[model samples]
Target: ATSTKKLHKEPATLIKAIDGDTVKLMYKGQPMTFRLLLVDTPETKHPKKGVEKYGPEASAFTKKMVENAKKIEVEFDKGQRTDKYGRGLAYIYADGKMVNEALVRQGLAKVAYVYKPNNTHEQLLRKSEAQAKKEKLNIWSEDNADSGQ
Candidate 1:
C-alpha cells in the first residue's frame, strides 16, 4: 500500500446527537453541526419518514458513547470538509475509538457514502460492516424486505 497522510483529528465537545448519523459539536469553541462521514444510521426523527428498525438503538448508542466519552475528536479526510448543507463532515472518535467503525461493527450503522480521497478508514469500516453482516447482527437481523434504508 502507498503511504498516505491527512490532517490530524481535532478535539471537540459533543453537544448533542441529532440522530444516529448526525451530531452537534463545539470545535475550537464554535458550535457546528456535523454529519458523520462513511456511515449512516437509522433515522430516529424524520417528519416525512417513519422511524426505522433499530433506529432508537442506533441513536441511543451514539448518545451514550459520545456522552460518556472521556475525549471526543473529529477527523476530516482529504475530501471536502463541509457539505452543501454547511455541516461538517467527519469521522468521530470517542476515547481513541472510532465511533464510525464501532457503529458499523455492531450493526447499528451502514457504510453509505463513498467519496475519494476522503477514503480514510474506508478499509476498516468496510471490513467491520462485512463482519456485522456475516454475524447477522441487528441491522442484518433476519430476512426482511425492509432494511430501514
Candidate 2:
C-alpha cells in the first residue's frame, strides 16, 4: 500500500543523470539521489548484472534532458519520501517540464509502481503511456521483441 499523506516539494540542481529515471542532484546544497515516481526505464548500467535492452537510449534521452536543463525541481510524495534503498522518490521538473511525463510520452519508459498519496500525476503518466503504446515508439516498437509490451 502507498501513503495517502502529503509530501513536500523543493528545488534541486541536476548534477548527473544515472539512467532514465535516476539522477544525482544537489538539494539544499547537499548531494542526493532521486528516483522518478511512477516511471521506470530500461536498466543500463547494473553494477552486477550489466545493461538491459534500450538502456543506452533511455540513458541518452535522460542525459539530454537534464544536462542542459536551465532549472530543476523535485516534489516528494506525501505518502513516502524515500524507498528502502534510500533513493528519494520524486517528480522531477526540468526547465518547466515534468521529466516523468516526458519519459512516458517519448516511449522511453514505462509507468510502474503507482503508490498512492504520491500518485498525483497518475492519470497523466498513464495517458502518456497509452499514447506511446499506440504509436509503437521505442520500447513499444515491435522490433524490440524483449520489450514485453
Candidate 3:
C-alpha cells in the first residue's frame, strides 16, 4: 500500500452565509463552519460590534456569491487550517472564483489576520485591497466608514 494524498480541497455545499466572512457548509457529509482566509469583512454579527459601516454591503456581497454559485469548493492552505473557535479557515472558490479576493477587490473587506505560512494568498489579498483602496470603494470611501479592525 502507498500513502494517500491529503484532501486539502473538497466539495462543499452552502448551508448559509452567516456573515460577510463566515458561512455554514455541508462539507464531507457533515456540517461545518468556515471563515474565509486573508480578508476580514466588516462586523455584521459580532455582539459587541454593531452593524459597522459597510457591514451590510459586505454581507450581502458574500451572500450573493454563495447564492449564485453553481458549485463550491473549499481549499486549505499549508499553514493553520482552523481557528480557535473550531471553525475551518480556508479559501472558498465560488463557481471557480475566489471569494476572498473578490471581497477585497470590491472593497467590502480588508486584508487581515495574515500569519506565517498560512499567508498563502497574501499577495492576492493585498493586490485586491490596493485596487479597492485606489478606487475609494466602500471600506476605503472614508476614514470612519472603515471597520478599523
For lDDT, the strongest prediction is: 1
Model 3: how far residue 106 lies from native, Å = 0.3
Could you arrange the candidates by lDDT from highest to lowest? 1, 3, 2
lDDT of 2 by residue, 61-104 (tens): 78788878778878876677889988878888888789888888
TM-scores of the candidates are 0.84, 0.81, 0.82
lDDT of each: 0.83, 0.80, 0.81
- Clash tally, candidates in order: 0, 2, 0
Best by TM-score: 1
Supply the global lDDT for candidate 3. Answer: 0.81
Point out the worst 10-residue segment of candidate 1 by lDDT: 43-52
- Model 3 residue 62 lDDT score: 89
As for candidate 2, its clashing pairs are: 6-78, 7-78
The pairs that clash in candidate 1 are none
Model 2 per-residue lDDT at 25: 81
Q: How close is candidate 1 to the true structure, as a TM-score?
A: 0.84
The residue-by-residue lDDT of candidate 1 on 29-118, one tens digit each, is: 887888889888755565346655675688888889999997998888777899988888888899998888889999988897788878
